[PDB]
């Protein structure tokens, strides 16, 4: 309650003179305190933060310096009396001390800068939040524009947009839009070095990137650079604060931590594109600031002839090589990087080039095997593999092996190759744009009732594709000998028994008839 935060605010007053008495009101605190972590300890957090808000609410500068010392012997009179717990940062409101520190160094950084253009944008920013007492006392005020100065930044921006609507851009009007850029910048430089001594804020920064982009479209050279080294000074403080919040959160609830990554990653891409027109001399520092954002510094090295920069990038990197190759494929000296990118299935190419033929043959056969999507292509790869191997320097022995193990492949393929042209327009099949079929599909397609002119050779080859299997063998052995008779219209069965040269075929199982047994007699004399 209010009686408590007015009792420690009374013990800090004595904590400047002596301690003994204050250390017994912190000792009466620990025994008389609640001590239930989850909210009563965030009831004394809501007290230490209500007194840091009042040492910030407190000769306007020497009086705000006296207040960064006061909130410094208030953070030392908490470390000692301790004050080693509580934290109710949650959403929107220990990090809260640092934050109120950082914004009191911001209040002294724009107190050190006092000119007629900012004092006007401030009076417009305070008359908009509420009215001011007109009993003189017109800074028009600060002690409350400190606890909340975050607001005099989003308003001294709306007073650079109405001073830009009248700017008529015209040169002196692009000098007033930079003077403000320089202050919001070194006010963000002052909060960074106060952390070294340890959605409106951000919108007003992505708003002045775009207005610092519209102006360099019309600007004397040198000026367009200083506002570019500035919007690079500022963008490098935003990307540093989204990096520090990432590192703050991890593990469980990851879904929210991989959705905030995509959001900062769609912005270091929107800050990169923006810098794609600008100077790339700053790219090296933007790429290092968000020390990866490689996709941007990798396409700046591509637009220029600096194959020296993309070698200096990969020289100092953790797995950029596996990144610059996968970032080349997704997208001259580009053929020297093609020489390295041809590492992987494009292998054979740089292998023919390197005169590494034997090698080209191994991978060309390997890609022929995995090949299942396109027949015409599985056929091409073997042919290439073969022409690679033949042109290579194998000993006549090894060569004879490569061309024999090969002759096999060509032997199976030839089957799908000789598929009649009657059933391939019947089945409405693409000539070449068809898949690498397997023994079954083939055997079953060579025997379809669609294949009309099916003759001795169609079945003979539909019995040659049985050693090309890897399910029921002798079920099919029957399926086919049976349509071998349906087509006979009780001549072909005759021939296929003439082509085989036998306890393969079945019998009683078959009838499952006058010349079937009749031919199965001069088939016991033939086999014998």
């Amino acid at each position: 309650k209010i009686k408590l935060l007015k009792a420690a605010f009374l013990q800090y007053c004595r904590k400047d003179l002596g301690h003994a008495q204050m250390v017994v009101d912190e000792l009466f605190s620990s025994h008389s305190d609640l001590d239930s972590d989850s909210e009563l300890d965030r009831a004394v957090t809501q007290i230490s933060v209500d007194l840091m808000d009042d040492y910030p609410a407190s000769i306007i500068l020497h009086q705000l310096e006296d207040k960064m010392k006061a909130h410094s012997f208030l953070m030392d009179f908490i470390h000692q009396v301790g004050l080693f717990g509580r934290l109710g940062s949650f959403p929107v409101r220990l990090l809260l001390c640092e934050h109120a520190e950082k914004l009191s160094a911001a209040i002294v950084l724009k107190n050190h800068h006092s000119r007629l253009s900012d004092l006007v944008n401030t009076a417009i920013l305070i008359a908009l939040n509420k009215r001011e007492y007109e009993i003189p006392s017109n800074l028009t005020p600060a002690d409350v524009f400190f606890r909340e100065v975050s607001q005099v930044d989003t308003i001294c921006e709306c007073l650079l947009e109405h001073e830009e609507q009248v700017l008529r851009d015209s040169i002196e009007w692009a000098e007033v839009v930079i003077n403000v850029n320089n202050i919001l910048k070194d006010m963000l430089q002052a909060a960074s070095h106060y952390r070294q001594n340890r959605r409106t804020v951000i919108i007003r920064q992505h708003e002045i990137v775009l207005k610092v982009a519209y102006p360099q479209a019309d600007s004397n050279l040198r000026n367009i650079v200083t506002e570019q080294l500035v919007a690079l000074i500022d963008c490098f403080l935003d990307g540093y604060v989204s990096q520090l919040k990432s590192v703050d959160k991890s593990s469980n609830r990851e879904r929210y931590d991989n959705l905030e990554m995509e959001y900062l990653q769609k912005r270091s891409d929107l800050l990169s594109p923006l810098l794609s027109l600008g100077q790339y001399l700053w790219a090296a520092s933007l790429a290092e600031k968000y020390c990866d954002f490689d996709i941007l510094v990798q396409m700046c090295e591509q637009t220029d002839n600096q194959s020296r920069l993309q070698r200096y990038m990969t020289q100092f990197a953790d797995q950029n090589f596996s990144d610059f190759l996968f970032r080349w494929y997704l997208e001259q000296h580009g053929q020297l990087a093609n020489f390295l990118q041809a590492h992987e299935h494009l292998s054979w190419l740089h292998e023919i080039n390197s005169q590494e033929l034997e090698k080209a043959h191994a991978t060309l056969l390997g890609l022929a095997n995995m090949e299942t999507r396109y027949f015409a292509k599985k056929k091409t790869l073997l042919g290439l593999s073969k022409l690679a191997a033949l042109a290579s320097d194998f000993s006549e022995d090894m060569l004879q092996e490569k061309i024999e193990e090969m002759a096999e492949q060509e032997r199976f393929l030839l089957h799908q190759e000789t598929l009649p042209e009657q059933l391939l327009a019947e089945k409405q099949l693409n000539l070449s744009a068809m898949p690498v079929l397997t023994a079954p599909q083939l055997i079953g397609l060579y025997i379809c009732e669609e294949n009309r002119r099916a003759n001795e050779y169609d079945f003979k080859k539909a019995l040659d594709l049985l050693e090309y299997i890897d399910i029921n063998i002798n079920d099919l052995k029957l399926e086919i000998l049976c349509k071998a008779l349906q087509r006979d219209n009780w001549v072909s069965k005759d021939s296929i028994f003439v082509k085989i040269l036998l306890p393969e075929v079945k019998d009683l199982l078959q009838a499952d008839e006058f010349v079937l047994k009749a031919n199965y007699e001069y088939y016991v004399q033939g086999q014998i």
Binding site: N353, Y374, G383, K386, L387, L390, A391
Partner: protein, 247 residues
């Protein structure tokens, strides 16, 4: 001595009762000239052979082969007659309109027209080209895929020994089949038919023709550095090395 030989043909052609000997000798003579690539020599002989010789002659092993050889030779010649026409055309592309920077308003309009006429000629020079490409290709596949036993390869196997001719027929295959392949590759590449270029490695390696035996190891690699070149242009188009969509 060129004339001595091309002149002994008219003597054998004169007497129709020696047409079988006229053709056979015409073949031999044209086998020497082919090994020298004297195509106007070979053809000047090829016309002296009456266009109706084959019909009348109708078969000893020496006459079945000489009839086949003669057509093989015609298939070869026609594969150079149509290439030189095609090649002559490839080197007559309409030239871009000349630019007159800082033009008068007169020169501006003469140029709006010269630029519009050129954009009509370049379309036809692809038109005539396509028809000279479709034709020269066909001929190159008639020779490379010669029907019924390959080019300069006897079908009849019961003739009497003729080592000169036989080894002349093996040689002609090793001088002219590597050379026709490399041309067809140049035709396919020149017209941007890259997918098909790569399909020369099926035609060649094929066990149906065994064309790869007619190649020296060096010629092969050369054909393999020719195909890798077509492949590139297929990557530039966004397809895989062999021309198939990257899914």
């Amino acid at each position: 001595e060129d004339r001595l030989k091309i002149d002994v043909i008219d003597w054998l052609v004169f007497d129709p009762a020696q047409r079988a000997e006229a053709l056979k000798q015409g073949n031999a003579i044209m086998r020497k000239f082919l090994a020298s690539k004297k195509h106007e020599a070979a053809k000047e002989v090829f016309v002296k052979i009456p266009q109706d010789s084959i019909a009348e002659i109708y078969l000893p092993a020496e006459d079945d082969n000489a009839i086949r050889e003669h057509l093989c030779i015609r298939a070869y010649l026609e594969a150079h007659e149509t290439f030189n026409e095609w090649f002559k055309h490839m080197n007559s592309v309409p030239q871009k309109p000349a630019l007159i920077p800082q033009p008068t308003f007169t020169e501006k309009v003469a140029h709006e027209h010269k630029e519009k006429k050129y954009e009509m000629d370049f379309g036809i020079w692809k038109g005539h080209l396509d028809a000279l490409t479709a034709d020269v290709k066909e001929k190159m596949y008639n020779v490379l895929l010669f029907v019924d036993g390959g080019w300069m390869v006897d079908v009849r196997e019961d003739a009497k020994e003729d080592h000169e001719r036989t080894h002349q027929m093996v040689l002609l295959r090793k001088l002219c089949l590597p050379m026709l392949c490399f041309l067809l590759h140049t035709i396919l590449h020149s017209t941007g038919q890259y997918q098909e270029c790569l399909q020369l490695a099926d035609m060649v390696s094929s066990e149906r023709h065994k064309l790869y035996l007619v190649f020296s190891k060096e010629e092969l690699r050369k054909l393999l550095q020719k195909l890798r070149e077509s492949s590139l242009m297929l990557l530039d188009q966004g397809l895989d090395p062999l021309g198939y969509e990257i899914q």
